[PDB]
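Students often ask why we bother predicting the structure of a whole assembly rather than each chain alone. The short answer is interfaces. A chain on its own may look different once its partners are present, and contacts between molecules only exist in the joint model. In this exercise we take three input lines together and write out one structure for the complete complex. Read the inputs first and try to guess which parts will touch.
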Amino acid sequence: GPVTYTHDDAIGVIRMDDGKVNVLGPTMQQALNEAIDAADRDNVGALVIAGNHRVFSGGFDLKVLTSGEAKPAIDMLRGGFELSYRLLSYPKPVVIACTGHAIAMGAFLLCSGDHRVAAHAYNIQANEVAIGMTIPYAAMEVLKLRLTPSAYQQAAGLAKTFFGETALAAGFIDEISLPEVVLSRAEEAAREFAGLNQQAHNATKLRARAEALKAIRAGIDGIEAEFG
Amino acid sequence: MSGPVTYTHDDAIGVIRMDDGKVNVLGPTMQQALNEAIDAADRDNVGALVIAGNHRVFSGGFDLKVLTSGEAKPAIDMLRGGFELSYRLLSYPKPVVIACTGHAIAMGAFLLCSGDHRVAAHAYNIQANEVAIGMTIPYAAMEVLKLRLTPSAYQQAAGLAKTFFGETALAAGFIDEISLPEVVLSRAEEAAREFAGLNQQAHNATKLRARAEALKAIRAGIDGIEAEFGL
Amino acid sequence: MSGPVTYTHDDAIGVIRMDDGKVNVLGPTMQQALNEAIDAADRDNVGALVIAGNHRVFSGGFDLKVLTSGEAKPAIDMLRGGFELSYRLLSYPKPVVIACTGHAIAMGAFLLCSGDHRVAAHAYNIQANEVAIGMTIPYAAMEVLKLRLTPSAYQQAAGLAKTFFGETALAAGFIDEISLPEVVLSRAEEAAREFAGLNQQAHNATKLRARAEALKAIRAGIDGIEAEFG
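Now the answer. The structure tokens for the assembled complex follow.
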């Protein structure tokens, strides 16, 4: 499978590896939702999402997006932004182990966790405008939730690439570690966050995100308009 | 036994220094003394106002015993008066400088974020610790944090009870300036004397345009204090 | 003598340079010359647009003589035309690069905040000095400031007339890149050429999604300009 799920009495860990660049297509999206389903059933104290040794995620399957029937593309875009909503509204602390580059939907997923760890050399970019695509509204709201006002303008309108210290200052990540310890740090942070009071964490995080979550929902409902 | 606030002033600034001999808890006595000191600064028509803590802390926040035990009315009245003070400082017609002379925890941090310019030292921990101790951050406090913190720091400070100090507190938007611990107070007074040179009328008008929506949301949070306890 | 604005272009970018021989006040002449220069860039359909100041400033802001004395109409018309320029640049369908070639004060700073990418040098003061000289920042300008500054920088820039320079201006959101003074303009041109390589239709659509709410509020501030004078 393209997703591995492991857990203990404290945390759950969901690791993406399709042997390539972790495209968020239907297979990968289904595997992720099934993994989060398990962590829901297992009632983990916190949850880690990690990529592979090559990338965090290169984003949506560009073949689906650029050719063929609109319905597969619509469903891929919807399921991807629904995952973001699911993570941004997750009742447990969510830690992202950005184990490689995070591009476009990979970057929006990166911005869907409570704490995000990457290494200095990992490029983070919403490259839509550079490849001829308009960033969907649901994606804009996720970016607006995390980036500084000025980084938001450059990331979206200019397809700007961030890495390490500039990604940290921009609000794309929360912590920098060495590449070989990105995952262990994320697991370690997840354990710390599992020690927070779960009920107060969920109530407070939803207070910090309620308006953004509603706008993300309207963006998901309006996905068809993004195709015309 | 004497009051927990010292007020001094000259022809330019007023200085309000909290010291209850402990951690400057923001209980009924401290709130009353603070409001009385600000009343004095209003009457004296100071050009700017400094709020400072003591040797140990800026403020450790509300009295946790009142919050976790007993009748809701003492708890409700304490939270309301605390967030009312934040409203008062955030809408003060003169520039307000915070001399963060120690750690600022929970309501200590929300008060910290209620002044126009905030000076702290490298080792002073700044944290809204509510989530770590089983409390949901009130709406009035959420609005204060959102007014000043960067988007990502707001998320971590509130949802993860993250602790900030010095350069990371500066980067987060919890403070505006770092000084050595022994010059935090003199630096804050210096800034206050500079800010008193601003045009007061334009300062008040402009700061209120910069805060109108947040203040209204802070007012709504103060009115809904009962909802934070379950009515 | 000459006009206060120079417009030149090639097949990729256009460059607009402000130089009234002083501090580039955004009075009626400069504003008209600016709008005419942007009109030319529109006709030429440039891929990206550079706005630059002179060797002394980016711009010192509005004409204070117009603002502080005489009939209200010249002042109102000046304020409106200045914020209309910010609206025009913030909603420009091409990438706009600001070559901040000197200090940028008050409306100069608000204009600086109207481009997509902002290049300055370390020594250049960026400041909305309104409160220090007795003026309330108009609503339209606050919306421009709020679009770009971090929440805390916003509070200090507006309420405290805080001055920003280099790394502090960069961290605040007043600029996006720092260059040595003699390369501010050429670096801005280089960046503008890169940005012309973006997909124009996606850049315009995406930037308007990032700004729609602020632009609506800037329009309301422009409609309410008379209320700023009473």
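Check your guess against this: The interface with chain B takes residues 130-137, 139, 142, 150-152, 154-156, 158-161, 171 of chain C (CB under 8 Å).
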